[PDB]
Structure formats: C-alpha cells, structure tokens
Amino acid sequence: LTRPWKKYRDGELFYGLSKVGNKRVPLTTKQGNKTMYKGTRASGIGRHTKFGGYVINWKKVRTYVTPDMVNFELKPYVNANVPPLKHEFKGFSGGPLDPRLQLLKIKEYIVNGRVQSEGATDTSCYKERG
Amino acid sequence: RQWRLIETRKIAKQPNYQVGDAKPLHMPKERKKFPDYKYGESNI
Amino acid sequence: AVRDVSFNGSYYDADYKKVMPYRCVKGQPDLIIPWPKPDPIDVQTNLATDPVIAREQTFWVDSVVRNPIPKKAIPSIRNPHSKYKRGTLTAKDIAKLVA
Amino acid sequence: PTTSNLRCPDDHPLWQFFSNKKFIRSADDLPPSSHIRPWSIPELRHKSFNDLHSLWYNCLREQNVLARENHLLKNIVGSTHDEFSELSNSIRTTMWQIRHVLNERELAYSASREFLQDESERKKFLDTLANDYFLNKDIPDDEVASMLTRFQLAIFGIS
Amino acid sequence: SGSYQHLSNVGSRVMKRLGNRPKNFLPHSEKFIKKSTPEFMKSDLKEVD
Amino acid sequence: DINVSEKIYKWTKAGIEQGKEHFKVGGNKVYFPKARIILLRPNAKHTPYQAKFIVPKSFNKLDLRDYLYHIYGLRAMNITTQLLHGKFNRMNLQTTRFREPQIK
RNA sequence: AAUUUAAUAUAACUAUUAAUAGAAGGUUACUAAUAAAUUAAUAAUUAAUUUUAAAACCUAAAGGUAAACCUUUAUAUUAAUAAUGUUAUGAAUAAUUAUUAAUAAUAAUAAACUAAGUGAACUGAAACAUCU
Ligand SMILES: [Mg+2]
Ligand SMILES: [Mg+2]
Ligand SMILES: [Mg+2]
Ligand SMILES: [Mg+2]
C-alpha cells in the first residue's frame, strides 16, 4: 500500500496527477541524449581548443565596474516632501535633444556658469525651465 | 499570333529610392549588371 | 449635504503636493468645496534621500568636445545591435540596386 | 563541531544582504509607502554620471535585499503581502528612469556636436558669442579671463 | 507555497489567457472566489478591472 | 620553472596581498548591470565558510566573483554552480502543462 | 425625490444595404520602460498635428543546429595622438588606459479576391468507351 490512507483503488496514480499531456514543450538542459547541449547564454568567452578544451579570451569576459567614490547619501527612493519636479522646454521644438537648447545651456555655462538651477536651489519648486 | 504567356507575366514594382531614403533591410551583395527585362524570366 | 459635485478645472496644490481639480458644487461654481487638509508626514526612514541634497544639481552641460558618458558605457545605456534602428541610403547604394 | 570556535566578524560583507542584521523586516521596520516616492526624470537630469552610477548600485543593493525577503516569504510563508515586491518595483522604476536620462543626455551631446559641425551654424553661434557677451566695453576686467577659460574648455580641448 | 515562479515568467500564453478571461463569463469565476473565501474578508461589491 | 597551477596560486596570493583583485579583470565593462542575486540559507551539507546564491540563469561563474568583489567587497575563492530542473506543473487538469522555471 | 418602458458601452456572431480603407505570434527572464513641441477654449486643463527614447531570444536564407542555442572580440580592426608600463636599444616600437577619422551588417510579416501552367475521378448517360 503506497499510500496508507487509500486502502482501495480510486484511480490515483503512483505519482503525479496525469500520465498524459502535451509533449511539444521546448527542450531544456536536463533532458535529452548525452550528446545534447542546450546552453544558458552564460559563456561567450574564449575558443574551444582542437583537443577539446577551452581558452578564456579576457577581452570578452564581463566585469561590473563600480565608481571609485560612491555617494552614500543618494538613497534609492526620495522623501515624499519634495514635489515631483517637471521640466518645460517652451519654445524648443526638439525637446531636450534639441541642439539650440544645448547651445543655450553652454551659453549659460559661459556667462554665470556652474550655478545651481532654480529647481536645485529650493526643494519647493513645482516646475523648472529646461 | 499574340504573345500571351510572355505578356501575362508580371513582376514586383520596386519603389523609387532617393538619397535621403530609408535603407532596405536586405540588399543584394553585388551591383546590378543588366537592365531588368520587362517580362522577367519565365516561371513555367 | 451636497446633492451633486462637479469640477471645472485643474490646479497645483502645495498641500496635497500635486495637481488637483477644483471641487465645486453642481450648479453654483462660486461655492468651492476645499480639499481636506492632508495629515502631517514625518519621514525618518534611512532609505529616503534628504530633500536638500536629493535635488542638489551636480551636472552642467559644459562641453561639446567631451562625451558626458564614457564610450564603454554606451552599450549599457542602449543596444548597439538593435534591429529597430535602420540607416539611410546614399548615392552609392542606389546606383548599386538601380539597374 | 561547535561554533564557539568561530570568530564570524561583525563587519562581514554578507551583512549587506540584510537590513540592520535582521532576518526579515516586519511591517513597522519597512519604509511606509506614504513617506516615499521614486525619483523623477527631471530630478535625475541634475545629476552627474558618477552620482547616477552611485545611485544605480545603491538601488541594486537594496533590490538584492528585498529579493531575498520576497523569496523567503513566498517560498516558506506563502503570504501575498508583496510589500517587498512593490518596493522593488518602485526601485525598478527609478533604475530605468536613470537609464532614460543617460541616453537622452548622450543623444543631446551628439546632436549638438553635429549641429555645430555645420560651418554656417558654427559661425553664427561663435559670432553671437563674440559680439554680445565678448568685446564688451570693459565691464568685465578679469571676469573675461574666467569667461575665456570656460570657453576654451567647452568649445575646444584647451584646459 | 514554494514554486520559484516569482523569479521567472514561464507560461506567458497560459497566464495571459487565465488573467484575461472573457468578460461575459466573469460570473463563472466570481462564484468560485466567493464560495472559497471566509466571510470576514469578502465584500458584496463587484470588482473592477 | 614552476607549474601552471603554482603560478595561479601565486597570482591569487599576490592579489590578496596587494589589496587588488585575486582574479583577472575582463575587458567587457558593464557599467549599469541589472542582475540581482538572492542569498540562501545554509544547508546541512554546507559549512559556516560558504554561501549559496540564486544567480541569474545567464551568469558565468566568473561573473559572480566580479559581482561580489566590486559591489559588496566580498571575495569568493571557489565558486561552483548547481543548475536545477523544472518539474511539470498545472494549476488545473484542463490547462496546458509547462515546466517550472529553471533556477541557477 | 423614486420606479417602468425603448435605444445607446471599451463588451458577441450571422445576413442585406450605405460609406471609408487596403492590417504580429511564441520562449523566459539581468522583465522588453519614455520624453516633448505648436495650435484651438474655460495659471492650469483636454482635443488635433509634429517630433522622440527603450524594445531580450526564436519564427529557412551572418554561419550552424535538435526554435527561443553555439561560433562571429563593432566595448571590434586600421591610423593618429597624451600618458603609463614597456621592449627595443634620445628616438623607435608595439601592450595597455583614454580621445578623434574610416571600415558593418539584423527578412514572422497574413488569409480571401485576380491571372497563368498542369489537370483528375466519383457521378449522368438508368450498362459503357464518343459525351458529361
Ligand atoms: Mg535523460
Ligand atoms: Mg557543472
Ligand atoms: Mg552539433
Ligand atoms: Mg452511368
């Protein structure tokens, strides 16, 4: 008696629920002949050797670079007491990518540059130009 | 006589491309060498 | 009690902290029903950036010769091998395809 | 084997996978939704690449912590509170907003360079700078020295 | 309830079909959810998509 | 003069001594990764000196070493991968059967 | 102030009549997101036009395969430069870091209608072959 709480035959399978179903599901790595090789897009580095080995090409390996100095104060969220700033590009057809806006921005940087914008000066401003 | 099986042949009408036009996704790898025949190659 | 209520426009409310409509009684628009006063807020969580430096501007457009983003960072910003980005034609290409 | 023989340090890096050395944050400890709001695209535009880089990884680190808590909750307790999931989604919103700002910024720089590459537009912009703010009636004496220093740095490669 | 489903998105077609049930047949599912929940988290109002 | 394996050991020792990577940094730089890893509670077959993670499926063994060192400062000496299977599942017998996600 | 009746919805198919026009699926994941401008009316707000970002893998034809997989260093090659190390032996020289010019590629893309080639048999002839 595989299941002591089922003394008589009720149609229950030895395991699982149904013995039949779809077989056209995509192949995975754990299933197939010993010569099958699915892969997990986790190795595009190096060149298989003629004998059957591998040689890491270190100009293709992937490395995650973090800034040397990390700003700890920038938390992932933002305090709710600062309103969501909005930007207006009135008179600029191309929007933030518009070249003449860039020219104006460098113009301001020339004459009285490196100056905090209106939105940065106060945490209570609702829209800002640019 | 009339040339029914040569006249009835039809070929695709390629669009006219200007220099300031979108690049087709797939293009031949070799320059065209002959003017397109009006009726194309017989398909039969 | 108020039978029915309508709205006749929108405005920015520094109390609700966002844009809200005007809530006027149906009929007379002069009688305006104010939105309720929001409850006080006290942010003490360490995962919230302080307002005074969250908004503090650090970047200025001060160059046309140096790319603000290093070249090796472009792939992370966008896909270089994008199928949706198609180029334009030239005189050479047209002559190549026109019989 | 006994753990009394160990010296597991208090500064051990894996502690960054926990919130204040807690197994799983409770409701009170979790940041409330009212007090919080994800960044806005305009706000990120006022940030340097280094700062945006710093924000990205700070977002990712807490994303790992929240992911660890979601998995523990949804694989053992089975509760559908999904408070951690919502927090992670809010961080995910900021992460792509950062990505949008960088792309728009890079495109803007390229567009400006191309626009200034045309001789007529470059000459107009330069002469406008020359006539209006430069060649003043000596109102700036040494300020123009600064003006030029930023001029060479921006338009050209002279530092 | 360990399923590892939250870490991936498998069965997109089936999930979409289940989550986009025809609106004509919602009463079929509404009865199912109602009969299978305790009375102290159930409201007598219809849901909203 | 020395075997390859001895040289590998020397490089790792040199990296730790100089406070630098104990591995070789590749040339493909990812500036804004979006991969997340889940810490897992120890099993009986583990020791207090190990840690198990649920990494992304498309994640090399080298990738985790760099991921830990550069983002967290943790140095992993030996890293080993266990990729699990996905059992067939169905919320009801009327729906199509599909495999559960594979978790690396 | 409430109720009934008939019609009207993002939320059915079929038939006729009138008008207008000739258009993504699947797999699972490091999830596959947007930004704006001009005009028209009560500082704001909708409508119309224009611009704009991202968009993983497979769907014969970059190559191959057992579809969502592997090889193709476009984060690439050549050239130049500043520096480092650095061989070579001040200069050179490549290696590296970082800039600028040139060198390059992404086919799922419907069905019905039309035209052309080839072209049956069952069946009717109360059988059958000319014929159908
Ligand atoms: Mg087997
Ligand atoms: Mg193995
Ligand atoms: Mg093979
Ligand atoms: Mg007959």
Side-chain angles (χ1 to χ4, degrees):
Chain A
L1 204 45
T2 87
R3 277 174 261 277
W5 55 95
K6 305 213 81 53
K7 285 175 211 242
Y8 68 98
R9 308 212 189 79
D10 182 65
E12 68 276 46
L13 265 62
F14 183 84
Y15 81 102
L17 288 193
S18 96
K19 255 154 97 153
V20 294
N22 184 7
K23 307 193 75 56
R24 282 144 142 90
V25 282
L27 255 190
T28 78
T29 82
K30 301 271 199 184
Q31 63 180 20
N33 192 31
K34 175 165 33 161
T35 84
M36 189 66 224
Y37 174 49
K38 180 59 176 300
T40 59
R41 292 174 296 180
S43 171
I45 61 171
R47 186 67 269 185
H48 296 90
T49 87
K50 145 190 50 184
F51 201 39
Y54 222 63
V55 301
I56 296 175
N57 192 31
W58 292 107
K59 293 179 179 179
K60 273 194 287 184
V61 168
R62 231 181 316 87
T63 43
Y64 309 98
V65 61
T66 71
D68 300 73
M69 150 171 317
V70 280
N71 225 357
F72 291 147
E73 187 229 352
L74 277 147
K75 307 308 181 303
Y77 314 93
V78 152
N79 181 356
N81 302 111
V82 68
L85 189 56
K86 325 205 176 160
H87 258 309
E88 298 198 61
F89 314 90
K90 201 55 30 160
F92 281 76
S93 76
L97 307 173
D98 166 12
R100 62 171 48 240
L101 206 149
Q102 284 339 285
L103 301 183
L104 208 148
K105 271 189 175 307
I106 70 154
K107 159 80 105 189
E108 306 292 353
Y109 167 66
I110 280 301
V111 158
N112 316 327
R114 199 50 53 94
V115 46
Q116 251 63 49
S117 201
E118 298 82 15
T121 58
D122 61 339
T123 169
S124 72
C125 184
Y126 62 96
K127 335 293 201 272
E128 157 168 277
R129 188 210 65 78
Chain B
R1 55 161 316 191
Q2 57 301 331
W3 304 256
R4 194 190 100 231
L5 269 164
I6 310 130
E7 270 143 349
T8 51
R9 268 187 243 145
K10 307 214 152 315
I11 40 73
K13 294 183 261 203
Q14 304 336 88
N16 202 340
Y17 317 93
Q18 292 182 330
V19 78
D21 206 321
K23 192 179 177 187
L25 189 66
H26 219 265
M27 292 177 72
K29 328 291 177 58
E30 308 287 328
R31 294 183 181 277
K32 276 254 206 309
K33 309 136 301 166
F34 296 106
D36 300 356
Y37 181 65
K38 173 184 177 186
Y39 313 101
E41 70 289 342
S42 75
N43 38 6
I44 197 187
Chain C
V2 178
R3 295 181 223 261
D4 305 301
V5 176
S6 302
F7 311 90
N8 52 5
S10 312
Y11 77 109
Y12 163 82
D13 176 25
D15 204 355
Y16 266 81
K17 189 86 191 144
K18 293 179 179 179
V19 48
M20 293 291 181
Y22 295 94
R23 184 174 53 175
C24 55
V25 174
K26 213 190 94 161
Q28 58 254 60
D30 306 8
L31 163 65
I32 170 56
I33 300 298
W35 281 121
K37 195 241 191 173
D39 68 349
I41 294 169
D42 186 17
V43 182
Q44 269 327 84
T45 66
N46 69 309
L47 301 180
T49 320
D50 316 316
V52 306
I53 329 174
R55 273 224 182 161
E56 165 268 315
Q57 170 161 296
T58 87
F59 163 74
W60 290 266
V61 181
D62 45 56
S63 63
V64 301
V65 64
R66 185 211 80 171
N67 204 8
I69 286 141
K71 188 177 200 43
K72 301 274 212 320
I74 302 173
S76 315
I77 277 167
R78 45 147 177 280
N79 193 337
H81 300 284
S82 166
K83 63 210 70 163
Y84 320 106
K85 252 52 136 175
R86 269 190 280 274
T88 192
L89 285 171
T90 77
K92 183 178 179 180
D93 289 345
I94 291 172
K96 183 163 198 230
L97 61 96
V98 160
Chain D
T2 165
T3 70
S4 323
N5 272 104
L6 270 192
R7 80 171 50 62
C8 55
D10 199 66
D11 48 287
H12 188 241
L14 265 186
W15 279 124
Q16 296 175 246
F17 284 99
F18 299 88
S19 160
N20 294 349
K21 305 178 58 180
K22 301 192 63 171
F23 197 91
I24 170 177
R25 276 189 285 185
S26 61
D28 289 1
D29 187 14
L30 285 175
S33 62
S34 308
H35 294 83
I36 293 168
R37 182 215 74 186
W39 292 84
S40 186
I41 280 277
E43 291 205 59
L44 312 166
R45 297 211 240 269
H46 311 144
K47 223 178 312 216
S48 67
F49 173 81
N50 197 96
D51 279 353
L52 273 184
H53 216 192
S54 199
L55 177 54
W56 184 282
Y57 280 97
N58 291 319
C59 281
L60 189 54
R61 268 177 277 266
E62 184 186 328
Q63 288 254 82
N64 288 342
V65 175
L66 286 160
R68 185 199 110 249
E69 274 148 309
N70 284 287
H71 179 243
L72 266 186
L73 193 142
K74 286 179 187 177
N75 214 311
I76 305 298
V77 198
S79 279
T80 77
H81 285 103
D82 71 36
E83 284 263 89
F84 313 88
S85 153
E86 298 272 356
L87 263 50
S88 167
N89 290 328
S90 304
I91 299 183
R92 164 175 292 271
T93 62
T94 65
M95 278 189 106
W96 86 253
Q97 295 199 140
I98 295 177
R99 186 169 186 262
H100 194 271
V101 168
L102 290 162
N103 195 28
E104 150 175 315
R105 167 183 311 182
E106 209 281 306
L107 290 205
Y109 168 79
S110 324
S112 77
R113 154 147 305 287
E114 223 173 305
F115 181 89
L116 230 55
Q117 196 36 262
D118 318 88
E119 197 269 338
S120 163
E121 321 277 356
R122 160 161 298 250
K123 171 184 187 48
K124 151 189 299 178
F125 153 80
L126 280 185
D127 64 45
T128 306
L129 291 210
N131 293 247
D132 274 6
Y133 274 120
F134 282 138
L135 309 171
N136 203 345
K137 48 178 180 180
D138 204 10
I139 290 185
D141 184 18
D142 55 10
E143 293 80 8
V144 278
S146 175
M147 275 327 95
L148 285 165
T149 307
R150 324 200 273 191
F151 184 91
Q152 31 176 78
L153 191 43
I155 300 306
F156 312 106
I158 328 173
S159 178
Chain E
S1 166
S3 78
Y4 288 130
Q5 297 260 318
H6 54 281
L7 296 180
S8 149
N9 171 42
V10 155
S12 295
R13 202 213 317 251
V14 183
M15 290 333 88
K16 280 191 217 177
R17 292 297 230 274
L18 295 174
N20 185 227
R21 275 290 106 196
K23 184 84 199 211
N24 178 347
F25 297 157
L26 248 60
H28 190 300
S29 295
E30 172 67 47
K31 161 203 292 184
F32 189 94
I33 183 65
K34 172 52 212 162
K35 72 157 306 305
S36 91
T37 201
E39 49 270 29
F40 75 108
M41 38 214 84
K42 206 49 155 163
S43 71
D44 47 345
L45 302 69
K46 184 178 57 180
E47 335 279 350
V48 279
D49 184 47
Chain F
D1 221 322
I2 46 176
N3 269 0
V4 175
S5 34
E6 205 264 8
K7 192 164 39 184
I8 301 177
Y9 191 48
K10 274 321 282 193
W11 274 323
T12 289
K13 274 197 319 227
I16 294 200
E17 292 151 1
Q18 291 170 297
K20 183 178 179 180
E21 294 74 23
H22 60 288
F23 54 94
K24 182 140 190 183
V25 176
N28 215 25
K29 307 320 216 143
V30 193
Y31 264 117
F32 301 86
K34 43 204 166 264
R36 335 191 291 261
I37 55 179
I38 296 183
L39 194 50
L40 282 195
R41 324 207 286 217
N43 202 354
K45 58 194 210 169
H46 291 171
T47 87
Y49 278 80
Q50 70 86 46
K52 168 96 77 176
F53 291 82
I54 291 185
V55 306
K57 191 153 112 172
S58 58
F59 213 77
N60 212 48
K61 283 202 300 180
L62 315 180
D63 302 350
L64 188 56
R65 197 195 309 112
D66 181 287
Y67 188 103
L68 297 171
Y69 176 55
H70 278 119
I71 310 179
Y72 291 81
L74 175 58
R75 304 168 82 102
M77 319 305 146
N78 181 22
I79 177 184
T80 282
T81 302
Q82 314 67 29
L83 184 49
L84 303 184
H85 75 283
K87 54 167 54 55
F88 267 103
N89 93 81
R90 39 171 50 174
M91 58 299 297
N92 53 75
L93 270 62
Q94 189 182 151
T95 58
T96 294
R97 35 178 265 189
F98 52 88
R99 303 180 185 273
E100 294 269 0
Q102 290 201 217
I103 298 301
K104 174 171 294 190

